[PDB]
Amino acid sequence: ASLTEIEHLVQSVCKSYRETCQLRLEDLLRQRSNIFSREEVTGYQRKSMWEMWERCAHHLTEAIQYVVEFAKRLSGFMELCQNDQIVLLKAGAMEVVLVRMCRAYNADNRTVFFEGKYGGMELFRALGCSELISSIFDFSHSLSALHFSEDEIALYTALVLINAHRPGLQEKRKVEQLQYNLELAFHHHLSKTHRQSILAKLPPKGKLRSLCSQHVERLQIFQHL
């Protein structure tokens, strides 16, 4: 790859990310003081497990659909075979959503933007799996310490998705090549902006995977990508 190719790849990834965010960062930041009242937190906790899962499942489906659009606009992804596109999305879409969450996360009070306001992990009590939700909130907290720019999140999430070690891939070296060009792009961007230090601070692949619920993987969205 040339300097021109790598610079064009950086631009493509960052443009795709920009066009596939549901919410604008500036709006998310302005809304930080808009926190659910105790009455509203109560209302969420009052819902049945099913009622809460129906709401959350829909929001996650939408989030996943934005990740799919992100992938489609990523230079090189649509050139991979259909099997591999699907394998990568199945294994990585939720991981991308969990990274994207830090944009909607407020480290100051440990809240996430959800249905129009900020709320803590106690909003999600009716779902059960309290340890997992805590672990998810802890994960966003750790990511928040890095102070990612949007271009950084864009390049990092591209690499979360384009992982040549996902079991079930049928063009392994082709995915390896795209992954490598994305590695070049990410490392390039970080060197030029003097941000190489974040490489050592990024959570490992295994960490992201452990945060993905079985219940998410069973959502019908994964049969209709």
**CA-CA-CA-CA dihedral for 220, 161, 63, 81, to nearest 10:** -50
160 near ligand 99N, rule: CB under 6 A: no
Residues 6+ apart with CB under 8 A from 202: 146, 156
Q: Which is nearer to ligand 99N, 16 or 181 (CB)?
A: 16
Q: Half-sphere exposure of 205 toward its Cβ, with a 13 Å CA cutoff?
A: 10
Only segment of 39-47, 85-93, 156-164, 213-221 that touches ligand 99N (CB under 6 A)? 213-221
To ligand 99N, the closest distance from the beta carbon of 98 in angstroms equals 7
Work out the angle at residue 90's Cα, subtended by the Cα atoms of residues 88 and 96, and round it to the nearest 5 degrees.
80
Hey, is 208 helix, strand or coil? helix
113 near ligand 99N, rule: CB under 6 A: yes
Determine which residue in the list 75, 95, 100, 152 makes contact with ligand 99N, applying CB under 6 A: 100
Hey, is 2 helix, strand or coil? coil
Determine the residue type at 15. K
Q: What is the CA radius of gyration of the chain?
A: 18
Site for ligand 99N in 118-147 (CB under 6 A): 124, 127-129, 132-133, 136
x-marked contacts with ligand 99N along 11-40 as a string, rule CB under 6 A? ----------xxx-----------------
Q: Which is nearer to ligand 99N, 97 or 160 (CB)?
A: 97
Q: Which is nearer to ligand 99N, 117 or 187 (CB)?
A: 117
Only segment of 31-39, 54-62, 164-172, 198-206 that touches ligand 99N (CB under 6 A)? 54-62
Q: How far is CA 177 from the centre of its chain?
A: 22
216 near ligand 99N, rule: CB under 6 A: yes
61 near ligand 99N, rule: CB under 6 A: no
60 near ligand 99N, rule: CB under 6 A: yes
Backbone angles phi, psi at 162, to 5 degrees: -90, 80
Q: Which is nearer to ligand 99N, 103 or 110 (CB)?
A: 103
Beta-bridge partner residues of 112: 105, 119
Which strands, in side-by-side order, build the sheet including 117-119?
105-106, 111-114, 117-119
To ligand 99N, the closest distance from the beta carbon of 84 in angstroms equals 24
114 near ligand 99N, rule: CB under 6 A: yes
Determine which residue in the list 6, 15, 41, 53 makes contact with ligand 99N, applying CB under 6 A: 53
Q: Which two tokens stand for residue 195?
A: 């941000």
Determine the residue type at 23. L
